[PDB]
Amino acid sequence: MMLEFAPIFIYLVISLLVSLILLGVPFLFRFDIRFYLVSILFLIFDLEVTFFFPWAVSLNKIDLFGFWSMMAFLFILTIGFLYEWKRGALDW
Amino acid sequence: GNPIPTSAVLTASAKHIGMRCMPENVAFLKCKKNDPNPEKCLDKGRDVTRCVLGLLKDLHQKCQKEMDDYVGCMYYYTNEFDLCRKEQEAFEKVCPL
Amino acid sequence: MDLIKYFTFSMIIFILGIWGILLNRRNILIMLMSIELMLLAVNLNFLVFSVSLDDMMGQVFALLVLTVAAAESAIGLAIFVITFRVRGTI
Amino acid sequence: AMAMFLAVSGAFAWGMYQVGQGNKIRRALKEEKYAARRTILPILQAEEDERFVSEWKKYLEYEADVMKDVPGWKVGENVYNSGRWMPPATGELRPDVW
Amino acid sequence: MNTDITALEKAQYPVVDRNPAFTKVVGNFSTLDYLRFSTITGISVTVGYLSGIKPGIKGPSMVTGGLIGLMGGFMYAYQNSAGRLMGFFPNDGEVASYQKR
Amino acid sequence: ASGWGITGNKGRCYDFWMDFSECMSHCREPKDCTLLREDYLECLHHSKEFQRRNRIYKEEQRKLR
Amino acid sequence: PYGFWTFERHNAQLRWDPQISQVAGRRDPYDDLLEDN
Amino acid sequence: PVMEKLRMFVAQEPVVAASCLIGGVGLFLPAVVRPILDSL
Amino acid sequence: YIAVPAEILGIILPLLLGVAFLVLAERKVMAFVQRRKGPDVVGSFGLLQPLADGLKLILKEPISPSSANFFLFRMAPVATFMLSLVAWAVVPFDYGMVLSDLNIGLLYLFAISSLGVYGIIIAGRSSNSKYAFLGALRSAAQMVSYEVSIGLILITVLICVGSCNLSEIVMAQKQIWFGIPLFPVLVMFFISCLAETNRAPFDLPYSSMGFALFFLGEYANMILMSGLCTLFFLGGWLPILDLPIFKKIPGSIWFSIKVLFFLFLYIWVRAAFPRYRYDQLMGLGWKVFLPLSLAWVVSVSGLLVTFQWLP
Amino acid sequence: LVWLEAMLPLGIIGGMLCIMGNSQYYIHKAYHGRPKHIGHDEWDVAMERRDKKVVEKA
Amino acid sequence: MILSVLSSLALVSGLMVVRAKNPVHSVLFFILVFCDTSGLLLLLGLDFFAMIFLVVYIGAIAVLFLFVVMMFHIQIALDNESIPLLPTQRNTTSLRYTVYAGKVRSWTNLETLGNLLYTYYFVWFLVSSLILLVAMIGAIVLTMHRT
Numbered sequence A: 001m002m003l004e005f006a007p008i009f010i011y012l013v014i015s016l017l018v019s020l021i022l023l024g025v026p027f028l029f030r031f032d033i034r035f036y037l038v039s040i041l042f043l044i045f046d047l048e049v050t051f052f053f054p055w056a057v058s059l060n061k062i063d064l065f066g067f068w069s070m071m072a073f074l075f076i077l078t079i080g081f082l083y084e085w086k087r088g089a090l091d092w
Numbered sequence B: 001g002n003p004i005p006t007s008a009v010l011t012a013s014a015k016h017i018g019m020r021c022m023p024e025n026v027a028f029l030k031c032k033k034n035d036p037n038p039e040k041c042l043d044k045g046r047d048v049t050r051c052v053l054g055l056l057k058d059l060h061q062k063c064q065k066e067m068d069d070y071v072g073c074m075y076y077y078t079n080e081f082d083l084c085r086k087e088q089e090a091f092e093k094v095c096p097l
Numbered sequence C: 001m002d003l004i005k006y007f008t009f010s011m012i013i014f015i016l017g018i019w020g021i022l023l024n025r026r027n028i029l030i031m032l033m034s035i036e037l038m039l040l041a042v043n044l045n046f047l048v049f050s051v052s053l054d055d056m057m058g059q060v061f062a063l064l065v066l067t068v069a070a071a072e073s074a075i076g077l078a079i080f081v082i083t084f085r086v087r088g089t090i
Numbered sequence D: 001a002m003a004m005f006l007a008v009s010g011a012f013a014w015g016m017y018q019v020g021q022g023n024k025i026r027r028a029l030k031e032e033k034y035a036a037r038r039t040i041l042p043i044l045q046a047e048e049d050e051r052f053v054s055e056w057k058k059y060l061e062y063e064a065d066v067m068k069d070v071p072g073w074k075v076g077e078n079v080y081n082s083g084r085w086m087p088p089a090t091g092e093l094r095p096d097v098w
Numbered sequence E: 001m002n003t004d005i006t007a008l009e010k011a012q013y014p015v016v017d018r019n020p021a022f023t024k025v026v027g028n029f030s031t032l033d034y035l036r037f038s039t040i041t042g043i044s045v046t047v048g049y050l051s052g053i054k055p056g057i058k059g060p061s062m063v064t065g066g067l068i069g070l071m072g073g074f075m076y077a078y079q080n081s082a083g084r085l086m087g088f089f090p091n092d093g094e095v096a097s098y099q100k101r
Numbered sequence F: 001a002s003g004w005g006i007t008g009n010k011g012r013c014y015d016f017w018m019d020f021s022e023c024m025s026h027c028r029e030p031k032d033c034t035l036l037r038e039d040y041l042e043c044l045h046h047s048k049e050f051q052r053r054n055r056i057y058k059e060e061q062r063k064l065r
Numbered sequence G: 001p002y003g004f005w006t007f008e009r010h011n012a013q014l015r016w017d018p019q020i021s022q023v024a025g026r027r028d029p030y031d032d033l034l035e036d037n
Numbered sequence H: 001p002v003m004e005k006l007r008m009f010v011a012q013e014p015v016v017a018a019s020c021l022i023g024g025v026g027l028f029l030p031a032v033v034r035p036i037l038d039s040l
Numbered sequence I: 001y002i003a004v005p006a007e008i009l010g011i012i013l014p015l016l017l018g019v020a021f022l023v024l025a026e027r028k029v030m031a032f033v034q035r036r037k038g039p040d041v042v043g044s045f046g047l048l049q050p051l052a053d054g055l056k057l058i059l060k061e062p063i064s065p066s067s068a069n070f071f072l073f074r075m076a077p078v079a080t081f082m083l084s085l086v087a088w089a090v091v092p093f094d095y096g097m098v099l100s101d102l103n104i105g106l107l108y109l110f111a112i113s114s115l116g117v118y119g120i121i122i123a124g125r126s127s128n129s130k131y132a133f134l135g136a137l138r139s140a141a142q143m144v145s146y147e148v149s150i151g152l153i154l155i156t157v158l159i160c161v162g163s164c165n166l167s168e169i170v171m172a173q174k175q176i177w178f179g180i181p182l183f184p185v186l187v188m189f190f191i192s193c194l195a196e197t198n199r200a201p202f203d204l205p206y207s208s209m210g211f212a213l214f215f216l217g218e219y220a221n222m223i224l225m226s227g228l229c230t231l232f233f234l235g236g237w238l239p240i241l242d243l244p245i246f247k248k249i250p251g252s253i254w255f256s257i258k259v260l261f262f263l264f265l266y267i268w269v270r271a272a273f274p275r276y277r278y279d280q281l282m283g284l285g286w287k288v289f290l291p292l293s294l295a296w297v298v299s300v301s302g303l304l305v306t307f308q309w310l311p
Numbered sequence J: 001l002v003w004l005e006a007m008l009p010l011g012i013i014g015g016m017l018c019i020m021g022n023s024q025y026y027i028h029k030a031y032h033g034r035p036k037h038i039g040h041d042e043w044d045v046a047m048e049r050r051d052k053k054v055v056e057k058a
Numbered sequence K: 001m002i003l004s005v006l007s008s009l010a011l012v013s014g015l016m017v018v019r020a021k022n023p024v025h026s027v028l029f030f031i032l033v034f035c036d037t038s039g040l041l042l043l044l045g046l047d048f049f050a051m052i053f054l055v056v057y058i059g060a061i062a063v064l065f066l067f068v069v070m071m072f073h074i075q076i077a078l079d080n081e082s083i084p085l086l087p088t089q090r091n092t093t094s095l096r097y098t099v100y101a102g103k104v105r106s107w108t109n110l111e112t113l114g115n116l117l118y119t120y121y122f123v124w125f126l127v128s129s130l131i132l133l134v135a136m137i138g139a140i141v142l143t144m145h146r147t
């Protein structure tokens, strides 16, 4: 079932080789704090997107309980996002 | 003469097997449910094999051409039921079950 | 023998993380990346054990520890950022 | 305007209904595929059992010969005190994935 | 999903309708339940009003404290009514009402 | 122990665990459920089977020389 | 105490697992093959 | 009141109002409509 | 098994040719929109222009700005080019014409898209120009902020299918395409892909090969996102919804036609609208697209669960 | 009429898209004889192994 | 073979992480550590977890660490439990019993996890949600200077 990653690895190797060939073609002849806040928001919402993936696929087995568990999870992160909003961390 | 029991033949004839081998299949599955030891279920397995290969021989003897193309195309598309429907209807027209 | 290799690799990763926390006491960033290495080693332990024992209690835990590791990264980097501002040095 | 909302909201209803109706057909097709597997499982399992018992006879014949000299031996003694039969373990913690 | 309402420590009082519905528990509220509900709500509203004067927000603090008090008092009253129905608290009136039913 | 399998079936060692735990549910002395505890711990790691196979291989190697 | 694992408070998996025995993800592989009939 | 504060909020925050409305519909359906269909 | 490199070459080389001709097509459509004619002298209709540009760029005798470690600077275009190309190993063109049929293809695409941030960052740092460093730092944040919305839209698409296999997401649209019900989701996905690729109004921005590799990677990302927009919402290789008599046309042609349509929308949007500012890009991506994507996830999941229309 | 000159590079792109998909359908078929199957589960994988063994046997 | 090299590269990368002069190089090797760990997970059949490691570790945490290092200063700096099986597999490989009952309807690593992550163990899921909320709240109060 995991046999479909060998083509991807060979693809990576060959893309490496062709990129090296392309590079070899011409050879033959202060601090800002908002940049940290955006990364923090990305980390949080990337974890949230990670937690969606099992939920979306397995939403047919779980029913009206997993849905509401995910809804409570989203409600908590939405309160967090609202706190993120009113504090001006989303403005530039 | 006797078809080779490979994936194409078995999956193609599964529709008929599920209607003429329920006793033997149920007995074998019940035997496996109690104990999973292979040496204690050889008697039921031989019965299932003998009941399935007889059906496979009968199908090939009755409709040789309507089944050869069906099994070949099943091998071609890797046991895809949706992509093999015209020939499936053709093969199931000769054999009602 | 593959479970032995999988456990040995993660044990070495854990030892490297502890070394980085100990050896690099002067630098703060290494003291965070070493903690993340330790968390990675432990997550690998949990996943390997879950696969070996045929049990789903290690995968759920690895997924739930990813969140803790990420939140620790966030808080630690915020604390470091405010720490550099005050004293002007690391 | 207002007709834009009507057409988008009617599309969101009719299209979701059609998506559900197609998911029903996909589920029926998948169930047919699964039901075609549970009718041929006994013969495959029977062949696997025959092959395994033959190979187990070979393995016991091998182990009986190699250490006939050793006083304390049983030749194919179950390691489980319960007496249940379990498949022989392998040095691979996930063999059927590669 | 499979659920089980059985408790480790058994009920020491007669049990009527072991797994009551939300509407039935709410409909079982007695005078004492309304008294404790109103007491918690009023205490919360008063605390919110008094604590919000110094910042300058009396009404907003009043409403926040009122929401907290309503939630807390309602869950306290629901807890008491459910315990009485399920037999964990003295259900003197519940058995009298549901015996003649 | 939990019984949740990796591939969506019952755990491989769950039946042994349920036999051991059922034994310990009506045995206040744990020296009489040892034979089931050993079975459960052998299903986890296969230590006894691997030891037997290693012994067979070592005996074969000794006979080789 | 003498055999505290025998107490009812310490035996909860013995009463919950039979209730969740038929849940998908915990079934014997041969169980679903016989539920058709 | 309500019909004026709501109007002011919707006018100056159309995207937030739209997202809240569609999310409220998506939460209303499995909370009020699903039990109704469970009777049938 | 020595034929896998043949497949990889057959999927990589035409990709590069298509990227060059996509640059040509952009420069031609942006000209016909502005009531002029693009490059026409070089070829019969300008078709030979990309080859001439490539040869002229190669024959330049360029110098390497080695005023750095010279390792990260040289490998950053390589790092982004590999990641841009590797995402094409899972995209299916017809029923059985996918190089690698992953069962986690959707999340694999999300991962590949999310790791594309490192190339621009390393390029910004390795170049000693401080302003280039700041520009790369801003572009990385924009790409991240819109990657979040792209992931949330992918979740909405995945809910209606129930599997992460890209070749099954297309088969799930045999009844109707997902672009019809989830049309606002399609619009949001297209806009997010516009901002993800640093293109059209969300487009705020060395020598020889490094710039060439960056340019090729960016245009390959454009082609990939145009392919995804039709892979998730326009039915992939599936024919037109009705009138089933033209079925003689191969399924790979319909995928191509829809991808070309989305590329035409890319060029059209670039030609029709001005450029946003950074203080407005981040606000637009954090306050207009995140709430809408989350609300659409909630609405779709609630509607499917309520009527038991789930996969 | 006059707008078709912008569709030539944009049709070359479509030709490239078609050839990328068709290059893996006649090369993969060349050395297998069978088109790639989508949705490989362990049942299909194991059943293919059994097919290979039975064909090798007879 | 594949396991040995994929472990050796990760060990060398971690050693360079804990013993690097320039923190940029340390973070770059810190990325390679997870790049190798993802492949190691893929060798176990946990395709979902490898992809999440790519998404989370070297997609969010590594990017955050890189942001902090770059724009800020770039300043300088066995036989007991499971006895191993000896290489006797010429006969052992033949002794491989396959049960077709568990293959008729096989779950993926994704849906197997999601079957019990949201219903039977949902409290831990909400606790992780609360941890994420704590991180969100603490990011602002520590680092926030408007106007």
Ligand SMILES: CCCCCCCCCCCCCCCCCC(=O)O[C@@H](COC(=O)CCCCCCCCCCCCCCC)COP(=O)(O)OCC[N+](C)(C)C
Residues within 6 Å of the ligand: E045, E057, E058, E059, E060, E062, E063, E064, E065, E066, E067, E070
């Ligand atoms: C329902 C689920 C929960 C919904 C909220 C969840 C999130 C919690 C948010 C809490 C913070 C916001 C709470 C609402 C803030 C608005 C408060 C309000 O509506 O009252 C206004 C105005 O509205 C009023 O008329 C006063 C209402 C307060 C008294 C109402 C009775 C007390 C109710 C408490 C118990 C019931 C709970 C609230 C109702 C459910 C405030 O009065 P002032 O502006 O100070 O008066 C103006 C005059 N002067 C400035 C000069 C002082």
Ligand SMILES: CCCCCCCCCCCCCCCCCCCC(=O)O[C@H](COC(=O)CCCCCCCCCCCCCC)COP(=O)(O)OCCN
Residues within 6 Å of the ligand: D008, D009, D012, H012, H013, H014, H015, H016, H018, H022, I179, I184, I185, I186, I187, I188, I190, I191, I194, I201, I265, I269, I273, I284, I288, I292
């Ligand atoms: C067959 C192919 C068809 C075409 C496929 C491609 C579609 C795209 C084609 C090109 C369309 C134009 C693309 C232009 C790109 C830049 C445009 C961005 C402008 C933008 O983001 O608008 C924002 C708000 O509007 C927005 O939010 C815009 C997003 C809205 C999405 C729609 C959501 C509606 C939901 C209604 C659902 C009801 C039915 C279901 C129940 C800012 O605007 P602002 O300045 O006011 O700032 C917000 C203050 N609040």
